[PDB]
Design an enzyme around this catalytic site. Structure first.
Site, mmCIF file in Angstrom:
data_model
loop_
_atom_site.group_PDB
_atom_site.id
_atom_site.type_symbol
_atom_site.label_atom_id
_atom_site.label_comp_id
_atom_site.label_asym_id
_atom_site.label_seq_id
_atom_site.Cartn_x
_atom_site.Cartn_y
_atom_site.Cartn_z
ATOM 1 N N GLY A 11 0.781 -1.222 0.000
ATOM 2 C CA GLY A 11 0.000 0.000 0.000
ATOM 3 C C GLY A 11 0.815 1.275 0.000
ATOM 4 O O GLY A 11 1.968 1.289 0.429
ATOM 5 N N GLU A 12 0.207 2.350 -0.488
ATOM 6 C CA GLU A 12 0.869 3.645 -0.538
ATOM 7 C C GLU A 12 0.546 4.434 0.726
ATOM 8 O O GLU A 12 1.155 5.470 0.993
ATOM 9 C CB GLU A 12 0.419 4.434 -1.771
ATOM 10 C CG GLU A 12 1.555 4.743 -2.735
ATOM 11 C CD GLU A 12 1.550 3.857 -3.967
ATOM 12 O OE1 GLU A 12 2.649 3.488 -4.432
ATOM 13 O OE2 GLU A 12 0.452 3.545 -4.477
ATOM 14 N N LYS A 33 4.630 -0.116 8.232
ATOM 15 C CA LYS A 33 4.271 1.201 7.746
ATOM 16 C C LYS A 33 5.447 2.136 7.989
ATOM 17 O O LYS A 33 5.900 2.303 9.124
ATOM 18 C CB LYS A 33 3.044 1.724 8.488
ATOM 19 C CG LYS A 33 2.617 3.136 8.078
ATOM 20 C CD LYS A 33 2.304 3.225 6.585
ATOM 21 C CE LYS A 33 1.830 4.620 6.198
ATOM 22 N NZ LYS A 33 0.638 5.029 6.994
ATOM 23 N N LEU A 83 -2.892 -8.773 7.702
ATOM 24 C CA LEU A 83 -4.151 -9.331 7.236
ATOM 25 C C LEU A 83 -4.036 -9.562 5.738
ATOM 26 O O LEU A 83 -3.156 -8.988 5.096
ATOM 27 C CB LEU A 83 -5.260 -8.364 7.545
ATOM 28 C CG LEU A 83 -5.730 -8.627 8.977
ATOM 29 C CD1 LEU A 83 -5.174 -7.556 9.900
ATOM 30 C CD2 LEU A 83 -7.248 -8.671 9.001
ATOM 31 N N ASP A 86 -8.702 -6.321 2.753
ATOM 32 C CA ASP A 86 -9.381 -5.195 3.384
ATOM 33 C C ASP A 86 -10.795 -5.248 2.848
ATOM 34 O O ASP A 86 -11.060 -5.939 1.869
ATOM 35 C CB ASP A 86 -8.699 -3.866 3.049
ATOM 36 C CG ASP A 86 -8.584 -3.602 1.551
ATOM 37 O OD1 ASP A 86 -9.592 -3.699 0.830
ATOM 38 O OD2 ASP A 86 -7.468 -3.265 1.098
ATOM 39 N N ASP A 127 -10.827 8.702 10.319
ATOM 40 C CA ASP A 127 -10.783 8.435 8.878
ATOM 41 C C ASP A 127 -11.193 7.009 8.501
ATOM 42 O O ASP A 127 -10.501 6.311 7.755
ATOM 43 C CB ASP A 127 -9.370 8.748 8.325
ATOM 44 C CG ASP A 127 -9.332 8.789 6.820
ATOM 45 O OD1 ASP A 127 -10.356 9.137 6.191
ATOM 46 O OD2 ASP A 127 -8.265 8.471 6.241
HETATM 47 N N1 LIG Z 1 -5.683 -5.227 -1.140
HETATM 48 S S1 LIG Z 1 -5.893 -6.584 -0.256
HETATM 49 O O1 LIG Z 1 -7.289 -6.612 0.104
HETATM 50 O O2 LIG Z 1 -5.364 -7.681 -1.025
HETATM 51 C C1 LIG Z 1 -4.929 -6.506 1.205
HETATM 52 C C2 LIG Z 1 -5.166 -5.471 2.165
HETATM 53 C C3 LIG Z 1 -4.358 -5.450 3.335
HETATM 54 C C4 LIG Z 1 -3.329 -6.461 3.521
HETATM 55 N N2 LIG Z 1 -2.437 -6.537 4.655
HETATM 56 C C5 LIG Z 1 -2.502 -5.694 5.858
HETATM 57 C C6 LIG Z 1 -2.433 -4.304 5.613
HETATM 58 N N3 LIG Z 1 -2.527 -3.800 6.845
HETATM 59 C C7 LIG Z 1 -2.509 -2.514 7.139
HETATM 60 C C8 LIG Z 1 -2.610 -2.076 8.481
HETATM 61 C C9 LIG Z 1 -2.622 -0.614 8.783
HETATM 62 O O3 LIG Z 1 -2.574 -0.187 9.938
HETATM 63 C C10 LIG Z 1 -2.743 0.378 7.629
HETATM 64 C C11 LIG Z 1 -1.606 1.221 7.232
HETATM 65 CL CL1 LIG Z 1 -0.414 1.147 7.907
HETATM 66 C C12 LIG Z 1 -1.732 2.154 6.160
HETATM 67 C C13 LIG Z 1 -2.955 2.256 5.438
HETATM 68 C C14 LIG Z 1 -4.068 1.455 5.782
HETATM 69 C C15 LIG Z 1 -3.989 0.521 6.833
HETATM 70 CL CL2 LIG Z 1 -5.107 -0.223 7.109
HETATM 71 C C16 LIG Z 1 -2.699 -3.073 9.519
HETATM 72 C C17 LIG Z 1 -2.712 -4.466 9.185
HETATM 73 C C18 LIG Z 1 -2.613 -4.772 7.795
HETATM 74 N N4 LIG Z 1 -2.617 -6.009 7.190
HETATM 75 C C19 LIG Z 1 -3.123 -7.478 2.543
HETATM 76 C C20 LIG Z 1 -3.917 -7.500 1.391
#
Ligand SMILES: NS(=O)(=O)c1ccc(Nc2cn3cc(C(=O)c4c(Cl)cccc4Cl)ccc3n2)cc1
Length: 298
Positions: A11-12, A33, A83, A86, A127
């Site tokens: 993610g960005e 992050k 995870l 989302d 948010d």
């Molecule tokens: N696209 S998808 O469905 O395949 C998909 C989506 C997510 C993940 N793994 C994942 C991301 N992620 C982000 C946070 C955060 O705390 C967070 C940060 Cl740091 C920045 C922006 C948004 C969030 Cl949520 C906490 C736990 C976490 N697990 C794997 C695949």
């Protein structure tokens, strides 16, 4: 930081890049992050450091756990439990048939539990959005990036200049209330709830005024009658067009009356009239809540 091995950029983010590194010591897969911060010309503010340190303690089954906060090299890294999906991706994958009501209700219920918890600790999200709600194979859904708003802030554009979504922003924030409450999270969750049900964003504005006006066109332009003090808000303009409120039956069909009733209370203009997470948990809509397992393709 050398203790982690990045496996892939996922993610960005709004604060920085989010990687899916592995812990070289424990071997765990996590969500890393990277919050950009210099050393001299900046260097992570002490304030934010203590803020984040308080989020490490905010542990709840419906809140993504913050494993660690590394400040070395005068930089900021947040290590979160990982995870695979989302809610945004899940809704996109369920667009054709729609997420089953029982699952929608379960997710709503769990998120309200998470909010009830955070809110009882005077900690608000600010948010909430589908991309910030994470789910697993067991049927759980969790609030992610909780508290990182007060810690740092919510910029218009991310480090990647990517525009921040306004679709879930509460009206009080849009009208310039500088000291909004936990009610803003309930509003966002209400918008997400509607979206899961109808399979279409409730208020997809592409500018602050378009967001506000989309809200007004649906729920009616607020006035002193339904929202005491609204006309005295920082960005309230007497010149706002006056639109009449629409029926909820037309806004979220075919959600049953209990869901519509609950949603109406989550979308009340007046933050003080808006239902609290705790009160929402006792809503009749949840009398038959269950915890189904989603069909996830990871
Ligand atoms: N696209 S998808 O469905 O395949 C998909 C989506 C997510 C993940 N793994 C994942 C991301 N992620 C982000 C946070 C955060 O705390 C967070 C940060 Cl740091 C920045 C922006 C948004 C969030 Cl949520 C906490 C736990 C976490 N697990 C794997 C695949």
């Amino acid at each position: 930081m050398e203790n982690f091995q990045k496996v892939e950029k996922i993610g960005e983010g709004t604060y920085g890049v989010v990687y899916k590194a592995r812990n070289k010591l424990t071997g765990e897969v996590v969500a890393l992050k990277k919050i950009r911060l210099d050393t001299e010309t900046e260097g992570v503010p002490s304030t934010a450091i203590r803020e984040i340190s308080l989020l490490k303690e905010l542990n709840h089954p419906n809140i993504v756990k913050l494993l660690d906060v590394i400040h070395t090299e005068n930089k900021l890294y947040l290590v979160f439990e990982f995870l695979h999906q989302d809610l945004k991706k899940f809704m996109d994958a369920s667009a054709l048939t729609g997420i089953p009501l029982p699952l929608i209700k379960s997710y709503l219920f769990q998120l309200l539990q998470g909010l009830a918890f955070c809110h009882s600790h005077r900690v608000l999200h600010r948010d909430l959005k589908p991309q910030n709600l994470l789910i697993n194979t067991e049927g759980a859904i969790k609030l992610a990036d909780f508290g990182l708003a007060r810690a740092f802030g919510v910029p218009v554009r991310t480090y990647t200049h990517e525009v921040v979504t306004l679709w879930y922003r509460a009206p009080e924030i849009l009208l310039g209330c500088k000291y909004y409450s936990t009610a803003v999270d309930i509003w966002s969750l209400g918008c997400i709830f509607a979206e899961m049900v109808t399979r279409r964003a409730l208020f997809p504005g592409d500018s602050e005024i378009d967001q506000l006006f989309r809200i007004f066109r649906t729920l009616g332009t607020p006035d002193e009658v339904v929202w005491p003090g609204v006309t005295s808000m920082p960005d309230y303009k007497p010149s706002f067009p006056k639109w009449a409120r629409q029926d909820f039956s037309k806004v979220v069909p075919p959600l049953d009356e209990d869901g519509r009733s609950l949603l109406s209370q989550m979308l009340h203009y007046d933050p003080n009239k808006r239902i609290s997470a705790k009160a929402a948990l006792a809503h009749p809509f949840f009398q038959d809540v269950t915890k189904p397992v989603p069909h996830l393709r990871l």
